[PDB]
Ligand binder design. Structure first.
Ligand SMILES: CC(=O)N[C@@H](CCN(CC(=O)O)Cc1ccccc1)C(=O)N[C@H](C)C(=O)NO
Ligand SMILES: [Zn+2]
Length: 255
């Protein structure tokens, strides 16, 4: 199989006698195929930055093992050359501390795996607008990726209502350094949606939210370039191309 860096893949496996799916010594969770009772599904994602060139997963059954080989593709992302090397930068200590704290917090949240669906059918876009800055635009130095856009931005004037892309539970609902005012929803199965730069947060941590329910108003908080909604999906432990992910997910779960 082949998969573009920065994307998720829904792997389909026989259910009967299945024991475990492994990537070296890391276990990858599974969940039911909603249509085919003889199958299960796993999400496998490649990171945008520094992905392996190749991956081998093994599905262990009671009677045998199944190898699955996935070749990393570079895809056709937009990229621009950096003029100055992305060397160590020197933020104020107060900012270093905040960043480190929020990273620890988020790493913890993304680690607390929910082994059931909290979604309700297909994902919907969070507002009926258009993309102004796509996922995966990159900046390179010496042809190596230095940084990339980890979500997709939708055009929005400040104060535009934003709606949950699917049902779930709110895990994050505060102001953060990279993200500004942000909401993160757990949808189950290690799938999280992210809504950044809000001017107003309308939910709280722990709240059950329905698909299409208001979560906030769009803004420019924490944004250098002007008001817009930054939308992200984390799945399989990695930030992945959100519209690509929704397309894949909806192909399986929309009915
Ligand atoms: C670390 C950092 O400074 N993040 C900034 C800016 C740009 N990101 C970096 C990234 O991966 O988080 C690179 C970048 C962006 C665009 C093109 C090339 C590189 C930020 O506001 N991110 C939010 C999520 C966003 O993206 N809003 O729109
Ligand atoms: Zn963005």
């Amino acid at each position: 199989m082949e998969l573009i860096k920065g994307q998720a893949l829904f792997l389909e496996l026989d259910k009967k006698d299945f024991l475990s799916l492994k990537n070296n010594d890391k276990n990858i969770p599974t969940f039911a195929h909603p249509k085919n009772q003889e199958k299960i599904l796993a999400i496998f994602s490649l990171p945008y930055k520094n992905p392996p060139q190749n991956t081998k997963l093994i599905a262990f059954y009671k009677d045998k093992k199944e190898e699955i080989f996935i070749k990393t593709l570079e895809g056709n992302y937009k990229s621009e050359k950096l003029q100055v090397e992305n060397k160590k930068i020197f933020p104020p200590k107060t900012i270093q501390e905040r960043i480190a704290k929020e990273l620890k917090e988020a790493n913890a949240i993304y680690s607390s795996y929910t082994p059931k669906a909290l979604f309700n059918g297909a994902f919907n876009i969070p507002l009926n607008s258009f993309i102004t800055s796509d996922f995966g635009k990159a900046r390179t130095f010496n042809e190596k990726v230095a940084s990339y856009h980890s979500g997709t931005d939708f055009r929005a004037a400040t104060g535009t209502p934003i709606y949950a892309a699917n049902s779930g539970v709110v895990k994050i609902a505060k102001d953060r350094y990279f993200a500004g005012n942000s909401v993160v929803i757990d949808h189950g199965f290690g799938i999280y949606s992210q809504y950044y730069h809000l001017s107003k947060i309308d939910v709280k941590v722990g709240q059950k939210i329905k698909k299409g329910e208001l979560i906030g108003l769009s803004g420019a908080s924490g944004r250098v370039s002007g008001p817009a909604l930054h939308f992200g999906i984390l799945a399989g432990g990695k930030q992945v191309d959100p519209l690509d992910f929704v397309s894949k997910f909806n192909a399986i779960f929309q009915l």
